[PDB]
């Protein structure tokens, strides 16, 4: 398994909320 | 398994809510 | 597992709210 | 007079070439 | 006169030339 | 005359060439 996430010029701005993450990687992801 | 996300100029704003992930990548994933 | 996970010219402003991660990785990940 | 160039989001590759300006503003311009 | 230019999240990349300028402004310009 | 030039998250790679100015600003400017 090989994961390249890569991000380049990004502009946020109000982001007033829960944000959990830009980028997300794992073996195993769950939510409930 | 390989993955590639890439990302090049973005612009988010007024995401009020609840943003979990902006690139995502796993083996496994489930939501309930 | 290989996880290569770069970010390059990022603008976050006016993030009020409960920020967790911008990159995230791990074996193993689960929100309830 | 009044001038408000905001760009966001951006992605420019392989411009080879003469590349004068991305965003411009005066009073006066001219070319020839 | 008044200018306002701003730029946010940006990926510029082989821009083999003769790049001048990204952001310009002046009174004046002109260009033989 | 008011001049406001902003940038934020810039990613620049691979410009071999004559980059001669990111960001400019002046009363009068000419090229020839």
């Not at 982001?15 to 409930?32: E, F, K, N, R």
Request: proline residues 0%.
């Amino acid at each position: 398994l090989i994961v390249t996430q890569t991000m380049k010029g990004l502009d946020i701005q109000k982001v007033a909320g829960t944000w959990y993450s830009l980028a997300m990687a794992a073996s195993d992801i769950s939510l409930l």
